[PDB]
Amino acid sequence: PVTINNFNYNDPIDNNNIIMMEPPFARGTGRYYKAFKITDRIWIIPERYTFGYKPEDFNKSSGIFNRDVCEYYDPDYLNTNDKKNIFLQTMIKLFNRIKSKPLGEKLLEMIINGIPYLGDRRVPLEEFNTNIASVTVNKLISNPGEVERKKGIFANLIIFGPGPVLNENETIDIGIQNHFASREGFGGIMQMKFCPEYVSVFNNVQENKGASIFNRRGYFSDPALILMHELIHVLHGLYGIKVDDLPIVPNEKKFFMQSTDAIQAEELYTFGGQDPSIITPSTDKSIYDKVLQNFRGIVDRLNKVLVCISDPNININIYKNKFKDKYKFVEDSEGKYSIDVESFDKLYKSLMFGFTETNIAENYKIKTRASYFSDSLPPVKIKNLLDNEIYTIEEGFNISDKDMEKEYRGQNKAINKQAYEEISKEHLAVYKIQMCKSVKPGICIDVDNEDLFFIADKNSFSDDLSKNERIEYNTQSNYIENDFPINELILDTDLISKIELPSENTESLTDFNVDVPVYEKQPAIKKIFTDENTIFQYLYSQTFPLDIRDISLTSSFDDALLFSNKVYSFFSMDYIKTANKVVEAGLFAGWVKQIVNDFVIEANKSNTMDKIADISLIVPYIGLALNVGNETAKGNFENAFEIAGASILLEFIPELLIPVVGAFLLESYIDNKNKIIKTIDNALTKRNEKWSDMYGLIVAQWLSTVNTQFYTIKEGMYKALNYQAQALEEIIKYRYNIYSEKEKSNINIDFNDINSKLNEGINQAIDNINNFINGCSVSYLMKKMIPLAVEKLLDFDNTLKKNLLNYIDENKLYLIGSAEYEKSKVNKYLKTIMPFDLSIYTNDTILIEMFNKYNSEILNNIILNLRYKDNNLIDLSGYGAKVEVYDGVELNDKNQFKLTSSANSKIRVTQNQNIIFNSVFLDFSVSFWIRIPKYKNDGIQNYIHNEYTIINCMKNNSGWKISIRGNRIIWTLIDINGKTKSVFFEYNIREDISEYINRWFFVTITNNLNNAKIYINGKLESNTDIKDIREVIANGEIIFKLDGDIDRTQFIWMKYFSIFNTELSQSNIEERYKIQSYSEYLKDFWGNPLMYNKEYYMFNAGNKNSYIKLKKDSPVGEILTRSKYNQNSKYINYRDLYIGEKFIIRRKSNSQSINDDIVRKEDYIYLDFFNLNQEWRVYTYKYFKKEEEKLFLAPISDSDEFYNTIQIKEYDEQPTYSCQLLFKKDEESTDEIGLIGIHRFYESGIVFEEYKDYFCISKWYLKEVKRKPYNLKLGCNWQFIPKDEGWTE
């Protein structure tokens, strides 16, 4: 157990627990500080840290010390004895809080017991030397007024009060002659400057759900956690493992890049959580190895140390044993110390990955920021940490007794208001960038440096991957996982030293040599000019001065910059008008409701105006709100995102470090088979290490150059929504207060309710924004980063293949009967890429979830997606396949394309070579729509027997093809040996009415480990076992082109061709079918859009073989029976489609207007037809008294005894080409008269009798249309058949 000593500032000096210390940077020059021993080896000097600072710099000035920190100055802090006492007692309270749980007690125990080595790098191996400033500190033990008499004490930590910037706590190590014992294995006296009441503030914008009610309102930090974070640094310093290696350095070469000090891995390790993943495996190992060598230095010193030159009372064997314990060395029977590589590895991992801020916060139930890189809000002052109503040893602020344990409510700025005060911004200094508008005294926006985008410089990352490797029989693989089981830390009964501390008393320090760092302020503002109007500018435009009276919203960014009363908004044109609408007294409460509501709807937009697009998550107003990236506010953002994806949001596209992996040199073992096989096995194991290290390298870059940009975009959206809210609130308040005092009494309005309604809608919007942006980020990783690494990893593999194969062949003599087992070990192993798993490189559950969400969104499996977007097909997948459409290919804007019989009627897709690699175990699907013409009646055997290819993906006589043979559609896989597999779908050609011949249908072929399958229109049609073939090379060019022996007249139409890098499930396919079947417009029989002013024959789904004919003597439609195919052939049969009357759909109105000739559901039409060189029309009698009645077909007239108005309906919700025709009173009324269909009617009477079918209206149909599933066979289901080149009869 750790004991905290108690004392008061004014207690007498006892030369034991209360001393006058001469601290390391005081330099033996001058002056001494009353110091208090809080626990063994740890001291508190409750006074300002002055070392390296000038007195003036303790005042707020026009400059700042660091460029991130919002800096608070108070030169009076700690200027009285009583203040100094409060400091002491707060530290005692904080220490008590820290030791209130094992994890924290153990932190302190490790720190207490981790005494610095009695020397440093300058000291002979055979000597301990205590007379250095990193080891001994002096206490002045003479009385006041007397000649100075000093004795030395060993110490581990000295904690000071703050320097000039109260809220910038800092742990500092002692450099002597330009080297640091605490970075070279020895450790040394550690120093801290700390302030307990001026705490950091942070928010959690970036996480969802989050908080049952009051997120995301800002949180203040528990100074116990701030303290422990710094104590972690002390821990690393005392064990001498606080080493330098390659840091993270920000790129600073554009105006929008955040400028900051270099970041050592040790800082990211200290914070923990996701931040260690920014340190690459390469550098993790580099640091590990440095610390190991450093410890090899100490163990050797320990085997050699003989004397202490500076303190004869030191007992060599006592200290040798304490250091053995500190460093976890082992001792043999001869008393020789060595490194046990396991005890080292455990000690290391526990010190760097066990004790982290992230882990302590989790264990202590303290909330903290999500990352070293998170935004900050300005610091706040904790009124009284000594008040157990506010802050307690056991629970910090989050006191369950005050209902503050749940959700860290006790840290929430919006709930625990009585715990903190804001600091007057007169005392705060912040580094800002003043961005003044230029174009290719003006408008100048002040932006905090830390609000800018953090982008790591390419020099941030290790290229060790490029080094060669030496593969021996005993070669091992190195993985430093950045993780430590926190519960086992807590229960490791070997972790904490059982060796007593030696006496702290020693001889006086007489060598004061030490480097004291010197600090200076720099200007708080940097003025720059820029032509750019990105996030900071777009945000600024959404603000407005306090003293104004009558703000209005605008969509004109420029107007917003010019005029003080105009505030920019990214909501609809239309929100904006409602926002600006001035109403009378009585209508005001209603309007306040509408607009607060409209706001919430606007903020919640999360879908994509076009529904076929293949985007899961989007929030469409992000472009308009920030203009971040590539002019995202100009043009339709949704459209821009469809074309170019997550990239369009990035302000900077970083250049990746992707080293060429170094070659392997395989060692030789003349005469040892066992060592040859082990060298092979070791080579393959090492290959996995290089793959993994490379992925780890991509992840480090992703998180510190891309995911940071996206984070900044999340924060921006939080502010933008909040500005829009604030604006509307001001608009409402202003308009309310214009009203007469009486009018205002009869107007019921709650500003706290309005405020909390909007505040909710923003949190809903930010959940969607988080999901979208997170998705964008993973997308950039997976599409623009990982594949470029995989390209080089495959090179590496292919070089290693050659290498290992040559080696097996050179040593074949010693592989007596094993050479072909080993050839196939190597070939099989290096045939498949190592798959990328983000959980190997982090255990931040946020990131892992991001990544799992992505991988289970089927649309992210699309590796080819050809769509039309400008005359032209292009690949929307995100993998940038090259697409060449040649002149003989007909393209329309319904996404259709026609491959004909011409040489120039072809499309060439050149696939991205870095994502199809997956090749022995197939796992991919292909989907598209096709329209294949009817056979030609006279050329029937060529149809039946001649196979032609339509899409062909072959490289070296291996790959896949879709071919057609008459009424059959065929998928073929061809392996590297030419072994073949097939699956096909054949539609009937002897059917009265075919659902497939010359009509768009949807095909999906899926390939997995054991099956190739064809789906048609969502349904599984057939299937072929494909286990028995080998490797299929699926990365050739895809060539869309008719290739066989076919007529000039032969052609094919396709749309929506796409390829997925996984086997689609039935659900997936059925979804895609439904999705791709959807249209605002109705369709004709063939599946093309239904059109006005276009000749159509009529077909009835309920009476397939029936067609309408104007009765001879009469003005009614009789039903007849379609003629059959009338010819010799036994291979085919069908019913004629081009018969009955030639109908045409006319617009009732064209008004308002529009502007194109496509027919849409709910349109109002006249159904006309041609007769005797005239246009006639289909009416119904107004007053028919039965449930069904003959329709009336007669020339055009407005007779008030017949309805002519027809509304065109599609009652079926599943995909269909049938539509219905409903007769209405007129365009205005809701009264429904009946539906056009076919009914039988009684023919009189004295002659012979019978029933006979007629074109009719019926009320009965209307009673079934809302039933589900919709009956496809009802007689009111019509389809329109225009003449088509794909059908000849």
């Binding site: 009469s1114 003005p1115 009698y1181 009336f1192 007669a1194 007239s1197």
Partner: peptide, 15 residues
């Protein structure tokens, strides 16, 4: 407009 001609024929068809 010889249409009442048709009307009448229609009315006799339905009756």
């Amino acid at each position: 407009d010889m249409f009442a001609k048709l009307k009448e024929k229609f009315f006799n068809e339905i009756n």
